[PDB]
Symmetry: C5
């Protein structure tokens, strides 16, 4: 049985059209919760890919292209016990908020989506989404940024500076800010993130230094080879991401990394929503029971 009835969607569409003020109102009447629960772990489902022009999972066009299904898959994930929140661009969060599915959940807002997938300028990842001002006003609990560092692309320069400014603002507002770093290179006209252990470590050392106050910054890192060595890179709270996809082996790598010093949980998207098979509720539970061992 679907979490969102076609009747609720009629109300959502109908709301944005004639009662736009209700989006913000329902957002603020939202029941808030502490960032960290009793077990100090966090599990967040991500869906900020579309806004960056990335609808693929294994299926290019479809998958994420259909916003109604994206919302349904999200609603399912959020209904499963263990999921603390969601990460999304303003258009995704407002819908979920309007639908009333964000009570007692953690909302993470994606700030920059400028570096569109496949763009000649995707290293110049400009800040096009949430900004601290709107997050503070709306009550989102967490901020997130994508910081891809391409040494041979001048576009990285303005991105490093803009990220530093984002941290300045986030820290000053005492708003936790999640940075997703990567060392990236142009290979055959496409951007490929370097997932080697040393590259990840170098990206963390760089990202950690961005901002005039790094007391509210978290790391969103990829589970890579030799992960206890990558974790010796920072003292900052870290959340793991589940990229491309590959299945049991994937969950196993997370389980191991999840035990490392400083790791506080997961912030996965592509893999949990749109699993290789047809069972979102199942995939989300696995991950969930991996983060919150229900002690």
């Amino acid at each position: 049985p679907p979490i969102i009835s076609p009747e609720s969607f009629e109300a959502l569409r109908r709301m944005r059209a004639a009662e736009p003020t209700m989006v913000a109102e329902r957002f603020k009447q939202r029941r808030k919760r502490e960032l960290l629960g009793e077990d100090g772990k966090l599990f967040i489902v991500a869906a900020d890919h579309p806004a960056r022009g990335a609808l693929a999972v294994g299926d290019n066009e479809t998958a994420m292209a259909n916003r109604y299904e994206l919302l349904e898959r999200m609603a399912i994930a959020l209904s499963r016990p263990g999921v603390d929140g969601v990460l999304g661009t303003p258009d995704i969060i407002d819908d979920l908020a309007a639908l009333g599915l964000l009570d007692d959940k953690i909302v993470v807002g994606s700030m920059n989506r400028g570096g569109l997938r496949g763009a000649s300028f995707e290293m110049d990842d400009r800040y096009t989404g949430y900004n601290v001002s709107s997050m503070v006003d709306r009550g989102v609990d967490f901020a997130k940024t994508l910081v891809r560092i391409n040494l041979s692309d001048a576009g990285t320069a303005p991105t490093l500076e803009a990220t530093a400014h984002a941290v300045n603002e986030a820290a000053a507002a005492q708003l936790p800010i999640m940075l997703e770093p990567f060392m990236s290179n142009w290979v055959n006209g496409k951007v490929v993130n370097d997932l080697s252990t040393d590259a990840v470590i170098q990206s963390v050392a760089i990202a950690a230094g961005l901002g005039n106050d790094s007391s509210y910054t978290w790391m969103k890192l990829p589970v890579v080879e030799e992960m206890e060595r990558v974790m010796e890179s920072t003292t900052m709270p870290t959340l793991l991401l589940g990229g491309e996809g590959g299945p049991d082996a994937t969950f196993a790598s997370w389980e191991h990394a999840l035990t490392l010093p400083g790791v506080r949980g997961l912030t996965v998207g592509r893999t949990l929503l749109y699993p290789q098979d047809g069972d979102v509720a199942a995939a989300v539970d696995t991950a969930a029971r991996l983060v919150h061992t229900d002690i």
Copy 2:
């Protein structure tokens, strides 16, 4: 018998040189109306092309080049029952304002016209027209932006960011903002919008994510192949546009798309004004009865 006598036009010119404050005065004394009527549909005639250096329809030079005829054709459209409003640049609106043609009408203001037609820099569509400040002050009811996304042109970058800023301001002022997205490519030295179903869908996913609050943003989309699939791209209120031209087949495609979830009406220009045959009223009427079934 023209809706606009040469006397009215004499009064228009004279006023602009003699009583500039009057333009604003007549604009504010304008009778306002609710955005959405009883049937919740909207039909708007567009004429913001000239300011972007695009006077063609099938006739390059002429057509739109003559501002007096443009205004007449507009006056006719606005006089026909069913037309809720007009979309134009400040120069266009001011004239329709001082000519007393704006009663009970919805005014949409074009914001960016920098990406001139045929320019080497037309992907760098800078904000050269209306801004939220002047719209709020003047009382325009709707804001509109052109967001062409060209993955191989760096000019797209600053346009994405400027559009995000426009939405920030529009949302904060609770001013509905209409975004016209497109995926565009350079082909033989000219910019061509990709009207394939998947391109339109990708452009919507990107545009929707622009801004720090997307609770006041609408979509202005082209009627394309497989349109019920394009509409599964957003939950946002959508208005259809009638590009180039082609006639009965055109109206038929609109009629079908007009039934899709979330579609709220039309925002057409080139086709309704400057109809192939000689009758703006007839063409404007055909579309009007398609948007408002006179229930």
Copy 3:
């Protein structure tokens, strides 16, 4: 006998050097007048070319190079009945002011001179002179901008946006702003304005759309082929300019265009200051009698 005696120039020099405060003081004690007289026509002499690195008339170096003669020729023009005012950069206006020659005259300030003549960057015409703030404070009556639109030169982009900002400010301050549009192309490494009828029309449609309020904008257009057709381009008050030079034929073309709808007068420089024969007063009077026909 010159309108300005060396004793008077000596004082001008002494003042600037020894008591700069007197320039602004004499400027504000200036007797002001209504923009439009009883016949609603306007005749302004222009001299803002030097600041743009353009001293030629038919004579490259000399002509305008000598500032003292430029001022004399200006003083003569301003002394002839019929001349309502002058257009100049701050350095030209201040001198004419400190010399006490601006009483009961309309002052027009040149805003942008960045696009220097012969520069590889002359399409990037930055705002280097008067700004609305100083004009409002000083009491200048009119603002003027050069808006050359070169479709193949990226420099046009920032110029369009800066011009839009100038109009924003001018309109908000209720300060009339004169835009001089042109379509320009690079030909043999030099910038040449396209004076064909259709190009002028296209430039007007673009310029008219610049700004968030176009209720205070005027047009400064070149007398071109088929001018009653160019005038069907806008409803805005227009002033004619006399470019290069060529003499009786020139005055005749102005006389004809001067009868067209919306044309309010002249804003000529090179041709009346600097006449082929040397008689400024004669040249000026001819022009004046064409503007104010003593009706």
Copy 4:
């Protein structure tokens, strides 16, 4: 037994996660001291390299890559008598602060880290770390900037201007600001600082002139050939840096330069932390006794 225990690091990781406010609080409760002691000399240990993407010492990857060891090595240095303070990016200082290791110490904050090591854009060293605002608020005692001047790289331009702005702010806040100048060139695709006597002198003359008030600016120079001649370049307080590494000869060169007019001490990192032998305490003490001879 390490200065920092596993228990304190765990305490740290947990503070950053659940009590982020404690970082700033512990920072402000910090016991402050006068900039210059009784002997007027200063000895500061530097560790702002990681944030710039430079983890090497003789060992590329490792060395600085492990943040926990970096902090330990820092804790050791700070515990040795003679060390007045530390220079670091916000992430480094924050950890030390939380650890309770900055009492009676001088804190210097690295301002720009944009010019990443190995980047095509490393001459465009943007301001990505501490800014005067956060330093004044937090109570850091000193500001530091890297000013590499590459005559053939346009990126130097914005760096010179940004550095000037940093000095403007630092001076206005009466915050001492340390500039590390260098003349740099591209050699075989890599940036190499010119350590010749004349290059260092030229860099000082340039750096000294940056800012609208140079009454709070210090110099951080490299010990080079003919150093009493380099010191005849400025009247400003200078601190010496220990670059690459090379050992006894190194200490000897410092000892000599340390006697020159205007030299006030050391600000060394790579060499004292990460010495060729396994002894941070030994290396640090040797340096400390070179700065404060205990008169």
Copy 5:
């Protein structure tokens, strides 16, 4: 017998190090004087070259490289009767101020030094030194700018605009501002100023037009061929500069130009300081008597 004793210099360094507040204090306790004396002439010694990376005079490296000798040579010049003041970057002026050599002297601060000598970007002469704010606060009496205009170098564009802004601020603060214009070209990879009569004239016409108020702007021009014709370029107070060097012939050209309309004196550096021989006092007294005929 040096003007600045070594005990004075030691006191200067010690001040910059432990009492930076004193620099500003001694600067403000400075005895001020009227800009123009009884004879209305002005003689200023310049030393803002180092900050621009230009230490040469005939001797590359040395000459200006030694800041202590530079200050001594300056102290000598300032001690000679007839020298009204000095032009320098903040680091230069502060030292003199702290050394107490600025009483009853005119202080001119150099604003821009970004266009470093030999840089690929030296036409992009950014504002890196004094700004109006700090000059007004400190009490400097005059502002100075270098405005090199290179028609084939895009870097000139931002320099023209930044200069215009400097004049805006200087005029608004009623602070005299000195502009040093030049037409420059790239010749064999190096920047060479065009000293032909017509080029100088063209540069003046351009510079004079920069700013929104040119009632406080002066000209700093080079003594060139046909100088009474160059002076017919402006009505603005002018000061002559002594470039490269060449000796008796040089003084003679100044003496002649010094009689021209509008010329108010000298602002020379390279030549008076570091004379071809070892007689600073002798070179200065010559220049002084030339500007101030003891009357």
